[PDB]
Amino acid sequence: TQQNTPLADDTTLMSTTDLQGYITHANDTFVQVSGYTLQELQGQPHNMVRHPDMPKAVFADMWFTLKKGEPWSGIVKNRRKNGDHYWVRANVVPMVREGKISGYMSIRTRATDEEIAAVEPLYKALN
Ligand SMILES: Cc1cc2nc3c(=O)[nH]c(=O)nc-3n(C[C@H](O)[C@H](O)[C@H](O)COP(=O)(O)OP(=O)(O)OC[C@H]3O[C@@H](n4cnc5c(N)ncnc54)[C@H](O)[C@@H]3O)c2cc1C
């Protein structure tokens, strides 16, 4: 199925990746919503969650901003294990340890559907 899974108001997905984007930890809500357990996520890139409809230009601008040491945010469409889609607004922030960017943490809330209708014409003009 490709249908939408409506998320609750308190939905707060949080995860941590290394400098190459491979997941190092994931909170319990990310495990429940994504359908993947913690051990299946650890040591895996964050693209197993990526929905194929998401443009390449969205992630290219994120890593350009992240590699500059700056935080990034945007409306993201994700994919579950069964394959249902759910929109979020990712808030990826570079993690700094001893003056060095050690990784990136992100807190993903539920996307208001009005942010979806504003990027869908832009997303089909991006990829
Ligand atoms: C903390 C964190 C949380 C994330 N959460 C999500 C999430 O919830 N959903 C989601 O879909 N993605 C998420 N991502 C992005 C994920 O890691 C992938 O980069 C994304 O899915 C795109 O990878 P891809 O190979 O599928 O597409 P690609 O074809 O690789 O993406 C297009 C462009 O992305 C750029 N890019 C991707 N990875 C890198 C990299 N490591 N270094 C430099 N440039 C790069 C390249 O310029 C490339 O041309 C997250 C990343 C981080 C760091």
Author numbering: 8 to 134
The authors write:
The primary energy sensor for motility in Escherichia coli is the dimeric transmembrane chemoreceptor Aer (aerotaxis receptor), which responds to changes in oxygen concentration indirectly by monitoring the metabolic load of reducing equivalents in the ETC. Aer is dimeric and composed of a cytoplasmic N-terminal PAS (Per–Arnt–Sim; named for the representative proteins: Period, Aryl hydrocarbon receptor nuclear translocator protein and Single-minded) domain, a helical transmembrane domain, a cytoplasmic HAMP (histidine kinases, adenylate cyclases, methyl-accepting chemotaxis proteins [MCPs], and phosphatases) domain, and a C-terminal coiled-coil kinase control domain (KCD) with high homology to those of MCPs. The sensory module of Aer is the intracellular PAS domain that binds a redox-sensitive flavin adenine dinucleotide (FAD) prosthetic group. The flavin undergoes changes in redox state that trigger conformational transitions within the PAS domain that propagate to the KCD to transduce Aer signaling events.
